[PDB]
Structure 1
Amino acid sequence: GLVPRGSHMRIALMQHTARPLDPQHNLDLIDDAAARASEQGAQLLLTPELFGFGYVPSQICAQVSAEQVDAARSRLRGIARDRGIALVWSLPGPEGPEQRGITAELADEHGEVLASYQKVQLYGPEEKAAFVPGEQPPPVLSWGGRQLSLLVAYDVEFPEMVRAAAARGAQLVLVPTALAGDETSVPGILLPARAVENGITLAYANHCGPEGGLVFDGGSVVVGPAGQPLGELGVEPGLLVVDLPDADYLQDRRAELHRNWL
């Protein structure tokens, strides 16, 4: 509807099926989503993990060059500009095939990249074979009047990763993902916990449908700091649009002890 009294940030999440190794098609889909999100008055669009090339880690590593990643990145910056909306995307990193990870980046409505992050927790043997894990903590930055951060997919399943973002001041954690296999406890159990245990909002944007030998769950969701869904999708493609409203675990935690016990 209309932007409410008492909300100063409206976000959008893209849920859709990508075609493996067809970035012209996948980027066209993000362009359409960015246009529809901007038309609904969203200021930011979050898109799923590796969407541009499809979630096909072994085939990315074998077939997708650094020049082809750079061209998709350049076009995504163009979409943020031409559609006038901040965009979070996830591509392979910019290094060579054997040296790059899986990334997430935030570009503003001018097409400038404000923040970049390399996925720390790679999932399973195919990712671990195709990508190098990140070594840096998630970034946190002011945008639209809140502290935003980025994490990718499996990352958010580790309470430590979200705690790292929140400990640096994050209020809204944006998470491109690619979750298949009817893993209902991730959105159902883990994500609400991450939100509650840190007093933060998390946005989780998944693929859906048949893609790269898997069938993705959909279930994209924005979870508020009480653990409740501010909005959620089912299994079908969709554009989720949400207005964010305007125990103190982060202070009580004995971090110095905890760091020695992990």
Structure 2
Amino acid sequence: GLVPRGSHMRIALMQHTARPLDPQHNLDLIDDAAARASEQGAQLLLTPELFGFGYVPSQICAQVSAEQVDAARSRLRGIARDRGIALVWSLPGPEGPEQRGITAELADEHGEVLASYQKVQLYGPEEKAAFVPGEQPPPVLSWGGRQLSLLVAYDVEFPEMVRAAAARGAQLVLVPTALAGDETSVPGILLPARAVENGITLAYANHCGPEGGLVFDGGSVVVGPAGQPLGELGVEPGLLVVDLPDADYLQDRRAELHRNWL
């Protein structure tokens, strides 16, 4: 609807199927979503993990070169500046195939990448074979009047990863994801706890339907600091649009003790 009074940030999340190894089709879908999100007044569009090439880790490692990653990356920058919308996407990192990670990047509405992050917690043996884990804490930056951060898929399942962002000041954590296997407890149990336990909002954007030998769950969601969904999708494809309204665990937490007990 109209932008509500008492809200200054309209976000969108793209939930859709990708086609393995078909970046032209996949980036056309993000372009379409970016257009529609912008026409609904969204200032940022969040897209799923590895959407550009599909969620196919071993094939990305075997058959997707750095040049082809770089090409898709340029095309996404163009979509951001071509549709006038901040964009969060996830592709492989920019190094060679056996040296790169899974990444998430944020570009502004002009087409300039402001933040990049490499997924620290890789999920399972195919992902661990195809990609190098990140070694750096999540970035936090001012955008749209709040502190944004990025994390990718399995990361958000570790309370330590979300705490790491929130400890650096994150207020909205944007998470591209690719979750299959009807794992309802990630969005239904963990996500809401991550928001409550840090007093933050998290946006989680998944694939949905059949892709690369799996069937993705959908279940894309924005969860606010009380742990309730501000908006959510089911299994069907969709563009979720949500307006963000304008115990102190972060201070109380005895970090000194808890850093040595992990």
* 1:22-68 deviation line (CA, Å, top 9, x unaligned): 00000000000000000000000000000000000000000000000
What's the offset of the Cα at 1:12? 0.1
C-alpha distance in 2 between matches for 1:220 and 1:138:
21
C-alpha distance in 1 between matches for 2:197 and 2:46:
23
For structure 1, the residue ranges without an aligned partner over 5 or more in a row are: none
* 1:132-182 deviation line (CA, Å, top 9, x unaligned): 000000000000000000000000000000000000000000000000000
C-alpha distance in 1 between matches for 2:82 and 2:101:
28
Is 1:139 aligned with 2:132?
A: no
* 1:66-111 deviation line (CA, Å, top 9, x unaligned): 0000000000000000100000000000000000000000000000
What's the offset of the Cα at 1:240? 0.1
Q: Which runs of 4+ in 1 moved over 6 A?
A: none
- Give the secondary structure class of the aligned counterpart of 1:61: helix
C-alpha distance in 1 between matches for 2:173 and 2:132:
22
Identity percentage of aligned residues:
100
C-alpha distance in 2 between matches for 1:3 and 1:227:
23
- Give the secondary structure class of the aligned counterpart of 2:239: strand
C-alpha distance in 1 between matches for 2:92 and 2:29:
18
Root mean square deviation of aligned Cα: 0.2
Question: Superposed, which structure 2 residues align to 1:72-221 within 5 Å?
Answer: 72-221=72-221
C-alpha distance in 2 between matches for 1:126 and 1:203:
26
* 1:213-242 deviation line (CA, Å, top 9, x unaligned): 000000000000000000000100000000
* 1:97-130 deviation line (CA, Å, top 9, x unaligned): 0000000000000000000000000000000000
C-alpha distance in 1 between matches for 2:51 and 2:15:
10
C-alpha distance in 1 between matches for 2:53 and 2:41:
28
TM-score calculated relative to the size of structure 2: 1.00
Aligned length: 262
- Give the secondary structure class of the aligned counterpart of 1:166: helix
What's the offset of the Cα at 1:204? 0.1
C-alpha distance in 2 between matches for 1:79 and 1:117:
20
What's the offset of the Cα at 1:188? 0.3
For structure 2, the residue ranges without an aligned partner over 5 or more in a row are: none
Query: What residue is the counterpart of 2:48 in the other structure?
Result: 48
What's the offset of the Cα at 1:249? 0.1
